[PDB]
Nucleic acid binder design. Structure first.
Lengths: 674, 671
RNA sequence: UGAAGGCCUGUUUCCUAGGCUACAUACGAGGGACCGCACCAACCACACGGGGCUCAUUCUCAGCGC
């Protein structure tokens, strides 16, 4: 799509003029503008005179053009300039006089230009520069001056260049400038001269992603990083195939906080390799090939508070990863441990010993040979105040009675996307006196029973999507004990029969999702038994979704006294007949969806009440009757209501009476009908 | 959806899928058909049909009928065809079919007649096609005297017949059976005289009958000395064959023989020596391991043969057809050989095939990758007329590979990995070529002398081949004086010199889609607007879809008086130069869907609209003002042209007061 | 010259991604004889949009070297 039209859509002092194949600078624009998003055009230069119209510009974005030369007069003509952007342009030379007049500049970007060299003090007048960018413009020396300059610099970026080493002298121009992010990623460094980083005033973060490092190189690097204030350090995308004690020997004189080692094919962690980081707090090990772990692998990290292991262990191949017991006895303050995407065979009897502060534990798709959660696979976690356990995608097939007898402090439990297939006798949840949510969606099937949920009265949420439930109509209802339940998602299970005892006593329920369950027959005027009213006394219902159940007649009385309903979704059904006064008690309705039905007439004795305060209505794809007797009131309401109706003009068509087959509803003439 | 009283038609009252329980009577008395298929009827009282004694064929399939009445026949004396499949009948008494005599076809397929003991078909002297397939029978006996004199097509599939007694078939003494279906019956015995007892037997189907070489040997020894012409043996355990396997067939004028789906493993030496009249043979979906020059010995009269998926799979076990394999099939004319794993063609494989005309090789090879000047020496003595060679991963051809097939007409080379510069010598010798199929290859580099050696070409397909070197003078297509179709489509042609297509006076179809030739058409004109459609006066259908066009030059359609279809969909046309279609008066089809057209004026669309039969211009941001669409909307109100999806896909995206307004609903009076 | 880039056009691939189709299979009702219809679900197939990426040959830079 396009419709970029001729002139650019000018807005409130933000004149975006992207993708217009411009060649000149537009001048007609008001003199009160502060922004010029000139991105994505084919300009050749910026004459500093064609901007005399508006000396009110604040930020200039001229990225994605073919600018080859800037002029010093541009700065003085635009004295209120703060941010400049010239990425993906074709500059080649920066003279000593170019940036002389720009002094209110704070951010300056020159990313994909071609400054192969710089030999001057061109940033002298830049006492307000905060974020300087030079990433990917083919440089070969980090030197940008000879005296202490850029006093208030804050975020320097030098990615994708041809820097070969960091001389001690070619960085001394940062004597008293607090660098808070020094990006140097993807620079083929080969040497770190002594004093290379100590010369900077303050250094906080440092990015050396894709810098082709090796253990020797990073050893020299770390020996040159000591005795500074570094706090974040990343080493992604390297050849750090191994580590030992001497690898990070230099880091002992720093208050390091983060350390990223992702994407290194890190193969074997040496014994005590982190003994020198008693302040590390955020560690990553993602996407590597750790073969084994020993109780010395994490020795000394007595102060960690986060750790990721997502895809950290070797692949499946007959080579299988092996984390031996007592591996985490040192991480006495750890609280989060992601362990997704691994191939650990199963949990041993002491794996998580000593983790007396673990709170959040994820295990999504970490196992290959579990298939059964017995009462001993979690004995190692008996001493951890857990608050979450993500266990999706493990091909779990069955659970034993009292597996979770240990996690007496758990809140959320995730069991979705497995092959659980058993009768929930109710003893599986033994001990979870503090459970708060349980996630069972996407399993094979479960056979509920009267005493299934009796052991977890404090439950508050419950998800049973696509689980193909059975034995759902049993008295008393298995849900009766859950006095504190609020959400229910008993959806996409295909429930043929719903005894009306279900949901009795769940007074606190607020969300009920009951889609794709083919409960059609239950609603009937033919009534083998009196029309079911399972929505008996849930007075706290807000959103009730009964979509795609082949409904064709809602009994009168099912919505009686549910005064707080906010959204009703009855889409994808066969409703055509609408009993009078079905929505008499729904006055707070804010959302109503009856799309994709067989409704032919929209009368007032049904839709008045809900229409009285509606904010959003969706009733498209319906064979409306285009006669004033069937739609006159509706069309009037459409003419005089402020409700948000989506796709009004195109998806409200009458399939009758041919004289109007295709006629837009809103266009229906109503005058001569009374 | 829509159900209601069934949609009655001209004396054909279809009332399917209505969950009926009674028989409708309101229907006229001039009806001849009742398609009562797919309902829930329990039975058919022969009195509720008294209304119309004019019925001719009754279709009561897919119901729950449990009993019919003899009075039904006499109440409906003009009944000819009956159908009761997937019903639940259980017993056929001697009096049920007594009054039906004008019956010709009778079907009782999925009923439950576990037994029949009477002469119930006595009054059936007009029965032609009787069906009893899949109703749980255990004896083919249907009577005791010669009955069903004019029977013609008997079916007995999916039953529990265990053998064919000589006596339990004698009720067909003088009835010419022309199709005796017995598929999927676990036969174990063939008593002597089993088939000779029938008057005449022409075809016989024994599909899925669990046969073995011994069983079929006894069968064939009991089939001799009859008039059988077609015989099928699909889906069996015929794991091997020898000379004695078909020893009995020597006394028959057999014509067809199907052996598909048998895991047929090894053809014995001379195993077909007894069929000097076989004319249509099949061997599909088996596991022939090897072929010997004796494998087809004696079949001196064959005229068709399929080998699709006949050879063993890839596994290190590879099929091997040795040389001189077809020296006996001196009258063969068709040979399908799809889906095999023959490594390559030897130097004598097709020797002796001096009558082969149609040869297919679609996906038969695995290790060809190069068609040299010797892979077809074995075909030097065959008047071929087709060669299907798709899906062989061919990578390159040598000069003069086709120097042998001097009588070929159609050549198929699509769906391969051909990647070379067509120097022009590849087609050496094809002085009679008629069509060449090159679509779906890697890429070809054309040259001035590419097609110079095949002047008699008439069709040419170059779809998705990613052409290069297309603008060279003179055009490589210039020599093809007889070309008619061109399909130079989906190749992305940046530059088209206007010399191309000059002299192809006989061209009728040009397909030029998905080629992003946008720039060529331009008013800015680096060079004068290209007019490659210079003098093709025989053009009928011209498809230039999806090329990012935004301005057609004036003069490109001048004097092409026979154009019948123009497809300019999926472009960026918004501006329409006056009088672009002045010479297109015979236009029958016009497609301008999915464009940026905003106004439809008369000085452009008058002429084409004058005689149009079909127009497609949907998905366009029409201007809903009478100045832009008034004439169009009037024409829509007063024209008989076929416009598809008129009422829903012709919406104005302007001027908001009408955003979404159906075009046809646009009021025009006050303009 | 080569190398390098932003502008429009579009070619291929990749999914994701939706809807619609089509197929077997299943849970149900209801009728029925000793196994045929409606609702629903998932399944895979087919057609077509929609989201990323990778090529095209044009419109124009520079930096030259000589």
């Amino acid at each position: 799509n396009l419709y970029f039209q001729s002139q650019c859509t000018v807005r409130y002092n933000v004149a975006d003029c992207s993708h217009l194949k411009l060649t000149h600078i537009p001048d007609d624009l008001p003199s009160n503008i502060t922004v010029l998003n000139l991105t994505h055009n084919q300009l050749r230069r910026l004459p500093p005179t064609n901007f005399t119209r508006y000396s009110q510009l604040a930020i200039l974005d001229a990225g994605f053009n073919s600018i080859s030369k800037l002029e010093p007069e541009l700065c003085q003509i635009l004295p209120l300039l703060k941010v400049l952007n010239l990425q993906h342009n074709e500059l080649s030379q920066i003279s000593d006089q170019t940036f002389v007049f720009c002094t209110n500049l704070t951010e300056l970007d020159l990313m994909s230009n071609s400054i192969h060299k710089i030999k001057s003090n061109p940033f002298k007048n830049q006492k307000n520069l905060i974020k300087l960018d030079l990433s990917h413009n083919g440089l070969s020396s980090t030197k940008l001056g000879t005296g202490v300059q850029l006093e208030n610099l804050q975020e320097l970026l030098l990615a994708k260049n041809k820097i070969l080493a960091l001389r001690s002298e070619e960085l001394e121009f940062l004597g008293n400038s607090s660098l808070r992010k020094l990006d140097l990623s993807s620079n083929p460094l080969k040497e770190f001269s002594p004093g290379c980083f100590q010369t900077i005033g303050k250094l906080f973060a440092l990015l050396l992603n894709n810098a082709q490092l090796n253990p020797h190189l990073t050893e020299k690097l770390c020996w040159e990083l000591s005795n500074t204030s570094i706090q974040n350090l990343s080493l992604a995308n390297n050849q750090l195939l191994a580590t030992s004690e001497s690898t990070f020997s230099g880091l002992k004189w720093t208050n390091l906080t983060q350390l990223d080692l992702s994407y290194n094919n890190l193969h074997d962690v040496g014994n005590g390799s982190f003994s020198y980081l008693p302040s590390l707090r955020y560690l990553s090990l993602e996407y590597n090939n750790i073969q084994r772990l020993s109780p010395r692998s994490f020795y000394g990290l007595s102060n960690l508070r986060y750790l990721s292991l997502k895809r950290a262990f070797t692949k499946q191949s007959a080579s299988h990863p092996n984390i031996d017991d007592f591996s985490f006895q040192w991480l006495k303050y750890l609280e989060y441990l992601n362990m997704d995407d691994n191939n650990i065979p199963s949990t041993k009897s002491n794996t998580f010993t000593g983790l007396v502060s673990l709170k959040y534990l994820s295990l999504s798709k970490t196992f290959t040979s579990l298939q059964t959660l017995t009462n001993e696979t979690f004995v190692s976690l008996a001493h951890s105040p857990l608050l979450t356990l993500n266990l999706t995608k493990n091909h779990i097939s069955k659970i034993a009675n009292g597996t979770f007898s240990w996690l007496g402090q758990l809140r959320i439990l995730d069991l979705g996307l497995n092959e659980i297939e058993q009768k929930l006798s109710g003893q599986e949840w033994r001990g979870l006196r503090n459970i708060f949510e349980i996630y069972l969606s996407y399993n094979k099937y479960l056979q509920l029973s009267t005493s299934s949920f009796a052991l977890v009265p404090s439950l508050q949420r419950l998800m049973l999507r696509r689980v193909a439930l059975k034995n759902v109509d049993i008295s008393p209802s298995p849900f009766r004990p859950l006095r504190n339940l609020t959400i229910l998602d008993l959806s996409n299970n295909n429930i043929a029969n719903i005894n009306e005892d279900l949901l009795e006593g769940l007074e606190n329920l607020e969300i009920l999702d009951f889609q794709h369950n083919n409960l059609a027959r239950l609603w009937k005027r033919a009534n083998p038994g009196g029309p079911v009213n399972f929505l008996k006394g849930l007075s706290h219902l807000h959103i009730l979704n009964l979509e795609s159940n082949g409904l064709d007649e809602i009994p009168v009385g099912v919505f009686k006294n549910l005064f707080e309903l906010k959204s009703i979704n009855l889409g994808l059904n066969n409703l055509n007949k609408l009993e009078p006064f079905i929505f008499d008690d729904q006055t707070s309705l804010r959302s109503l969806n009856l799309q994709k039905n067989l409704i032919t007439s929209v009368e007032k004795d049904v839709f008045g009440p809900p229409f009285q305060n509606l904010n959003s209505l969706d009733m498209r794809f319906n064979p409306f009757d285009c006669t004033c007797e069937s739609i006159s009131w509706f069309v009037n309401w459409i003419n005089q209501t402020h409700t948000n109706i989506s796709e009004l003009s195109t998806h409200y068509l009458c399939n009758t009476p041919h004289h109007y087959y295709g006629f837009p509803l809103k266009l229906f003439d109503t005058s001569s009908c009374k």
